[PDB]
Amino acid sequence: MYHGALAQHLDIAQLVWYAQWLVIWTVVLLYLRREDRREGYPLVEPLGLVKLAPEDGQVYELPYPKTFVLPHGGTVTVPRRRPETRELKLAQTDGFEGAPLQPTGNPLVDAVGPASYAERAEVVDATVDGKAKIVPLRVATDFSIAEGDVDPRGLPVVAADGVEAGTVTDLWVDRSEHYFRYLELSVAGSARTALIPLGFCDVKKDKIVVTSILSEQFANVPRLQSRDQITLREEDKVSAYYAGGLLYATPERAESLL
Amino acid sequence: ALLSFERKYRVRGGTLIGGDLFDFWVGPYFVGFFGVSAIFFIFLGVSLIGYAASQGPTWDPFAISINPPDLKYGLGAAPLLEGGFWQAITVCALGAFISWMLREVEISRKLGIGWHVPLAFCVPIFMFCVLQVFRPLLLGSWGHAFPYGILSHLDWVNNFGYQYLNWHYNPGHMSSVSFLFVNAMALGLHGGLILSVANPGDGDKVKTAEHENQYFRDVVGYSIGALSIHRLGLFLASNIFLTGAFGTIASGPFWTRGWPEWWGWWLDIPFWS
Amino acid sequence: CFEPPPATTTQTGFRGLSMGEVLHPATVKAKKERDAQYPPALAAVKAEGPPVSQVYKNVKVLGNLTEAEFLRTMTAITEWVSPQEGCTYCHDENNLASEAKYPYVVARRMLEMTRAINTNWTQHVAQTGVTCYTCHRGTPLPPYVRYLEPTLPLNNRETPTHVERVETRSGYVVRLAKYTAYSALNYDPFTMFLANDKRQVRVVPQTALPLVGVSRGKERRPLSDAYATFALMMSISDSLGTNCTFCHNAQTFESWGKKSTPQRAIAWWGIRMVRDLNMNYLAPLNASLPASRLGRQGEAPQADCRTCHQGVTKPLFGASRLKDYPELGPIK
Amino acid sequence: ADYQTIYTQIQARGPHITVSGEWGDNDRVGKPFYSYWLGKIGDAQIGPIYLGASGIAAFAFGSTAILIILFNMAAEVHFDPLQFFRQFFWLGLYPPKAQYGMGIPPLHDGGWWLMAGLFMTLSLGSWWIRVYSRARALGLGTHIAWNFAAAIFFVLCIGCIHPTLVGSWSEGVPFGIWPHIDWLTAFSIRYGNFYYCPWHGFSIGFAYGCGLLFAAHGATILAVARFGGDREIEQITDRGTAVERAALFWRWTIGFNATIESVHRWGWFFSLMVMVSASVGILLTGTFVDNWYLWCVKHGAAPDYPAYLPATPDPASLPGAPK
Numbered sequence A: 001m002y003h004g005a006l007a008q009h010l011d012i013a014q015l016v017w018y019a020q021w022l023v024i025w026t027v028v029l030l031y032l033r034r035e036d037r038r039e040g041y042p043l044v045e046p047l048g049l050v051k052l053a054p055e056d057g058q059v060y061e062l063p064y065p066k067t068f069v070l071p072h073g074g075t076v077t078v079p080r081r082r083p084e085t086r087e088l089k090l091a092q093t094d095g096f097e098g099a100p101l102q103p104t105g106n107p108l109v110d111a112v113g114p115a116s117y118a119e120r121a122e123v124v125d126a127t128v129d130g131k132a133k134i135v136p137l138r139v140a141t142d143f144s145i146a147e148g149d150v151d152p153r154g155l156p157v158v159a160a161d162g163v164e165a166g167t168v169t170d171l172w173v174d175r176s177e178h179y180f181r182y183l184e185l186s187v188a189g190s191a192r193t194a195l196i197p198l199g200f201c202d203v204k205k206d207k208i209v210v211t212s213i214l215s216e217q218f219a220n221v222p223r224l225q226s227r228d229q230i231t232l233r234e235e236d237k238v239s240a241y242y243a244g245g246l247l248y249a250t251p252e253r254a255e256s257l258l
Numbered sequence B: 001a002l003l004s005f006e007r008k009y010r011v012r013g014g015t016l017i018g019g020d021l022f023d024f025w026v027g028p029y030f031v032g033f034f035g036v037s038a039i040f041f042i043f044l045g046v047s048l049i050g051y052a053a054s055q056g057p058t059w060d061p062f063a064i065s066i067n068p069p070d071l072k073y074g075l076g077a078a079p080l081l082e083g084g085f086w087q088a089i090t091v092c093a094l095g096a097f098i099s100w101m102l103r104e105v106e107i108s109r110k111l112g113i114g115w116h117v118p119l120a121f122c123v124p125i126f127m128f129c130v131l132q133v134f135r136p137l138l139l140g141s142w143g144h145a146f147p148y149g150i151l152s153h154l155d156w157v158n159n160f161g162y163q164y165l166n167w168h169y170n171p172g173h174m175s176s177v178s179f180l181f182v183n184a185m186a187l188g189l190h191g192g193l194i195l196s197v198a199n200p201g202d203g204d205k206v207k208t209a210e211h212e213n214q215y216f217r218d219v220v221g222y223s224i225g226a227l228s229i230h231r232l233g234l235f236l237a238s239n240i241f242l243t244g245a246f247g248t249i250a251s252g253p254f255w256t257r258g259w260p261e262w263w264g265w266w267l268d269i270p271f272w273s
Numbered sequence C: 001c002f003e004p005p006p007a008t009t010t011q012t013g014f015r016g017l018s019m020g021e022v023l024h025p026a027t028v029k030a031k032k033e034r035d036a037q038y039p040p041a042l043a044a045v046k047a048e049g050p051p052v053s054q055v056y057k058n059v060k061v062l063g064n065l066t067e068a069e070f071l072r073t074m075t076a077i078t079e080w081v082s083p084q085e086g087c088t089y090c091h092d093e094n095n096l097a098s099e100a101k102y103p104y105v106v107a108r109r110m111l112e113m114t115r116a117i118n119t120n121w122t123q124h125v126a127q128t129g130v131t132c133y134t135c136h137r138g139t140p141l142p143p144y145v146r147y148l149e150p151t152l153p154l155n156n157r158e159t160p161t162h163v164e165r166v167e168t169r170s171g172y173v174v175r176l177a178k179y180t181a182y183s184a185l186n187y188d189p190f191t192m193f194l195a196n197d198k199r200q201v202r203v204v205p206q207t208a209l210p211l212v213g214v215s216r217g218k219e220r221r222p223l224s225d226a227y228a229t230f231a232l233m234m235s236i237s238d239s240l241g242t243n244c245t246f247c248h249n250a251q252t253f254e255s256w257g258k259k260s261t262p263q264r265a266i267a268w269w270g271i272r273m274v275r276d277l278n279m280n281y282l283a284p285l286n287a288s289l290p291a292s293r294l295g296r297q298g299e300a301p302q303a304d305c306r307t308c309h310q311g312v313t314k315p316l317f318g319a320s321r322l323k324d325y326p327e328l329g330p331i332k
Numbered sequence D: 001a002d003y004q005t006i007y008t009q010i011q012a013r014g015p016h017i018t019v020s021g022e023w024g025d026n027d028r029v030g031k032p033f034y035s036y037w038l039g040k041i042g043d044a045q046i047g048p049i050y051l052g053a054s055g056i057a058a059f060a061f062g063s064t065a066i067l068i069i070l071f072n073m074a075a076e077v078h079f080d081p082l083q084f085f086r087q088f089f090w091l092g093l094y095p096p097k098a099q100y101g102m103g104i105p106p107l108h109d110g111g112w113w114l115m116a117g118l119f120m121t122l123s124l125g126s127w128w129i130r131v132y133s134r135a136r137a138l139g140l141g142t143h144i145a146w147n148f149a150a151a152i153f154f155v156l157c158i159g160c161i162h163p164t165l166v167g168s169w170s171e172g173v174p175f176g177i178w179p180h181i182d183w184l185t186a187f188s189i190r191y192g193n194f195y196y197c198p199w200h201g202f203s204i205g206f207a208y209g210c211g212l213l214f215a216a217h218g219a220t221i222l223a224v225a226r227f228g229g230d231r232e233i234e235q236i237t238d239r240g241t242a243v244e245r246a247a248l249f250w251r252w253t254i255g256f257n258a259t260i261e262s263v264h265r266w267g268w269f270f271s272l273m274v275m276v277s278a279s280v281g282i283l284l285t286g287t288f289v290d291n292w293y294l295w296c297v298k299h300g301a302a303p304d305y306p307a308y309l310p311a312t313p314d315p316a317s318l319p320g321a322p323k
Ligand code: BCB
Pocket: B097, B124, B125, B127, B128, B131, B157, B158, B159, B160, B161, B162, B166, B167, B168, B170, B172, B173, B176, B177, B180, B240, B241, B243, B244, B245, B246, B247, B248, D184
């Protein structure tokens, strides 16, 4: 006789094999793949006209809503209805369903393609204890550059075309994580300030190189509402602007490299 | 067809070859030229697998095995039934993988994001080359490569290991295993942490970046931070194969004895011998 | 640290299974030259005159040889066992029939043992056979023997370190490791498996499910038997200068048929032969040996796979003297 | 290229933040200090460390286990300090070599091993309490503790649950560098090749997937660091372009996608499943399966191959063969 034998050529290990697959597919299909759908759902078709009743699969693929209690007041529930309101300055290059769109205007200002920003809250990101998280050093006076590292304040900013475009006046720091996220710079010849994500900055000891945009394009970087704080949507607008330059700053950057 | 936020990103451009000719989607899938070459190679490889499998003994998926040639064929072409199909399928695999990587750089360019993901995907393509191309080149036969079969490839890993008496003593393997283990552990920690901050339960309020770091400082006295854990995770995972490849390439070409014996460089120093 | 390419490789299983030998040419060459020192056969002599049973006075084993045949043997024995010492190693200069020196009596038993090997163990030595040279390699004490505890160095022709010396207890783990191909396995495969026939080498169950009545508590073999078998296999592999796939398809170490090479069967016979040699020929000789030959437990030196093979899958790369010295076996 | 994803170009310093917990705020010891080279690839601040009761209990029991092991190891080299460093990797503390069943073994043959096992287990439980309570003290979910629980459960499986289910302490994992390695082959040989254990397969599948997921996830976040994707908590509660691009990269590549939150559930689940699958495998081994290869043959899964050199009959089964 055998430990683990059952009647008619079954054994326990054989059953557990089936059970294990059942557990896996249950968690993956009925749990994880629905969690995956708490954003961007329900999907968008060539006009979903049936306003009278929902299609069955759209209800089945969604999880029950969850509510986040925000740390400084408010609640967010996902999933939820969030259509993109703003007019997009794009035109269909063809009649095909998945043909690409073309920018009709200037895609950096129009904020399309890689220049697109998400419609986040017009809200300032906050520290544990309520202060503004992302602040320039003139405000965050107990924060310093670490000894060892370039102080960029005073250095010029060189754009993709090699032209000096402005001068770094300040660093914005994340007070929650102790990490610099933007440089502030005056754009020469325009009597205004612009913010730059550090990730677009090549910090050299005599200059800040910036390959994403041209010098002239520093004029139309999204401006902030206030001088000394930034909203989450503004952070998106600013970051997106330079990323759009990777594909759009010159006509040649959108075409094939070969 | 489209996610609620997707349309504004679905713009023209960012390809590496062909411009507009392949710049479009099919359902959710971006195509591009490397989309096309990928499907080509996938279709070719899967055909060859099917033709080869039918000339074989069985159809049980656990027992099908397309194998490389005998060692005696060296680095030459081998007859289709006895190694040739393996040779053909291998080339389709490399075509498919590289196409897949290049397709991801195109998708990356269109979205204006970093190329880090195809970069990371190079590591497993590289490891595949170490096993199927580079190490068989160094030894002089495609016969030293591994066979394509669900269970058969484990028999090759098995015997390959025991060809060096105890593979666990391979120092490249020891390094590789250590990164596999710590990577799996870190991913649990990282995922656990994020979920614990966003989902405290009980209708309690979601916590903060500072809570994240406070937790690990409290428990282990240090917290690498949000951006850094993602850099570390790519580093940890990549080094499973980056360090492992040395332990693999070494075995045969640069070491022919058991791997325990290799540690004689330490044990047999005369000072303490 | 490393060994430069190229490597010589062979195939011992179906393509795609990664079975076969991996050899460093330099190392093979050095072993080939060491083994080529095997002295060539002495010239054949005409069988002439009466059997030496009627001519000499104390000839118990080689009695059916003629005088020239027998003295040819004695020359070969001296070349193989004591070339530097000469005939006087075993003999009194003035009385060649005197057994007063212990090498004489031992040599007589070695003659019987050697013909036993070539007659009763053809399942292992085949038509190749052994001579005294196979083990002794030109010295009375063979360079590769074993005591009831591990000794270093493996070649007793080299001089031991203080730590290598068996009486230095702090060096035991290293003495053990070097016998098991540098593994940390905590088992001495020689006294466990090769000194006698008391232990079973196989440990793997031959059924899918555990059989009730052998599978729980004290009915079970301890896991240590599996460590020990593994240690025996490390040691065996190192003794033949080869790896597991020479004998096993590691898909199923316990299966025969297509899962084992013919060398695995020959190895199986080798285990039985070594047991016979140690139990019945070599271990009893502690009565006839000086105390400086015995180990710390009064045991004689005994044989393992390395005694004959010395790092080569065939001893002396298959060299044979069987046809040249019929008197060493096989015997009808 | 985004050099920020490689290292911090300009580091920042500021006053050290302390988030207050429901208890133990005074048991944080040490003064924080800063490392400039650490700060290139991470956060520069080291310390302070919390120092509760469970953490000290862990250190207490752990050190006891370590000391029992080190002492037995030193006994193995007759306390020669030089041979101890030389042979360190080869030294070990072993479970019983003889079959005592479940009886408590003599100290010279496995008793000390059992002892070291007990104190390590207490050390793991104590640290688990630390990992759990620190989360609740800071008002966080207990996700890490439940993953860590699976990892502890797997250790108990190979350490003592599987021994007690088959009824022999001789099957535990030895303590030591090479000797705990040697156990893996002894065990796999005993139970008929672990490649043919489906739960080995599952565990490996998930372990490899942890490499796939963390390479893919880490690479993704770095690829969207310019839009702030590293600030994942606020990207969960207020989807930004970072996670839109990350989601669309994968959707356009493989045809579907996760969310910034759900990718961490995936990762957490995959990690957990490495340890859960491993434990089911060990729990079945010896109790209900004796030879995993023969079990796969029984159920028609094992591959077979032609002979290359001639098939070889078991000599022990030929007529007249010795034992
Ligand atoms: C008895 C023999 C053993 C052995 C023999 C062994 C060998 C011979 C080798 C390893 C190697 C490795 N071993 Mg080891 N091993 C390992 C772990 C590991 C890995 C970390 C490492 C790398 C594996 C690899 O190269 O994947 C390869 C994975 C690849 C190439 C992925 C390719 C993916 C491709 C790019 C895309 C594929 C696409 C699909 C076809 C598409 C289909 C998708 C569908 C869904 C549409 C552990 C954790 C253990 C334990 C716990 O004991 C262990 C024991 C053993 N190993 C035994 C001792 N092992 C390797 C190593 O690094 O050694 C130093 C190695 O060469």
